[PDB]
């Protein structure tokens, strides 16, 4: 006694040992405080949001490199947590959050070493960097949470760009990959990473009634592959039979995890 834990999977009472136990059901992202982990096979804990008992880490590894739990610690933040929405209809959710709540959501501009085209303007389209070599060194100095190459030019989203929005009290809506989650954590700027999970190929067409089936299958395959690799990085997983419900859940998740005190992974 005793540490704090975070569920990386959905667990139901009845599927394991019926409701006829003192067991505790929990969903992905639930933070549990363990009281007794002495039992080799099963663990005593309580929900931090409601007192009972939860299965162990080595135990669930036996049933199904499997994902069980991650140890977490409470931390106080003084900035607004950045946002990383992933999965189907993420672009619509990103654009909708910014238009609907302009006082609490903002966006940042990526850097590039590509010569600024005449119609483009610096600071809005891109932060245009005249010296390529300078950006490559900033990349090596861990100044970028994401960086790539296109037509022999560097593109990237800097940690400073994100932090500037965050320190003005606004959630930075980020168009980045899941790999940016770890780098933001390492920069002590922990994002709310939300994964929109399609229940099936048919569900994709339900939450996105615009795209074709051919596009839906590709989006579904990308979503399944995304969940395979970055599930640990997800702050939450949301589902729905419509985009409006998904959007509804995204708003709730953001509100719940935007508190002064948050839970972050431990050693």
């Amino acid at each position: 006694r005793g540490f704090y834990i975070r569920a990386l999977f959905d667990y139901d009472k009845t599927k394991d040992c019926g409701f006829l136990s003192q067991a505790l059901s929990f969903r992905f992202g639930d933070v549990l405080h363990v009281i007794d982990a002495g039992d080799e096979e099963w663990w005593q804990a309580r929900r931090v949001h409601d007192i009972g008992f939860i299965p162990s880490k080595r135990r669930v590894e036996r049933r199904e490199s499997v994902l069980s739990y991650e140890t977490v610690t409470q931390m106080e933040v003084h900035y607004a947590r950045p946002i990383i929405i992933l999965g189907p209809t993420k672009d619509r959710a990103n654009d909708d959050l910014l238009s609907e709540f302009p006082d609490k959501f903002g966006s940042c501009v990526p850097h590039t070493t590509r010569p600024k085209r005449e119609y483009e303007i610096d600071g809005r389209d891109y932060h245009f960097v005249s010296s390529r070599e300078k950006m490559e060194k900033d990349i090596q100095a861990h100044k970028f949470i994401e960086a790539g190459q296109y037509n022999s030019h560097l593109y990237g989203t800097s940690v400073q760009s994100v932090r500037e929005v965050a320190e003005q009290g606004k959630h930075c809506i980020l168009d980045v990959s899941a790999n940016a989650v770890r780098r933001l954590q390492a920069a002590h700027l922990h994002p709310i990473a939300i994964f929109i999970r399609p229940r099936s190929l048919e569900n994709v067409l339900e939450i996105n009634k615009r795209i074709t089936e051919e596009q839906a299958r590709k989006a579904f395959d990308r979503a399944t592959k995304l969940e395979q690799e970055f599930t640990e990085c997800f702050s939450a997983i949301v589902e729905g039979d419509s985009f409006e419900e998904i959007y509804h859940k995204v708003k709730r998740v953001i509100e719940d995890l935007s508190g002064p005190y948050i839970w972050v992974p431990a050693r």
Binding site: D91, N94, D95, L98, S107, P110, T112, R114, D125, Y126, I139, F144, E146, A147, G148, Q149, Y150, H153, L154, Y155, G156, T157, I173, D175, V176, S177
Partner: peptide, 16 residues
Amino acid sequence: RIRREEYRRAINGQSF
């Protein structure tokens, strides 16, 4: 409105 496809092709293409 926050999306730059040049940036996207840079990232989802080959990245650092």
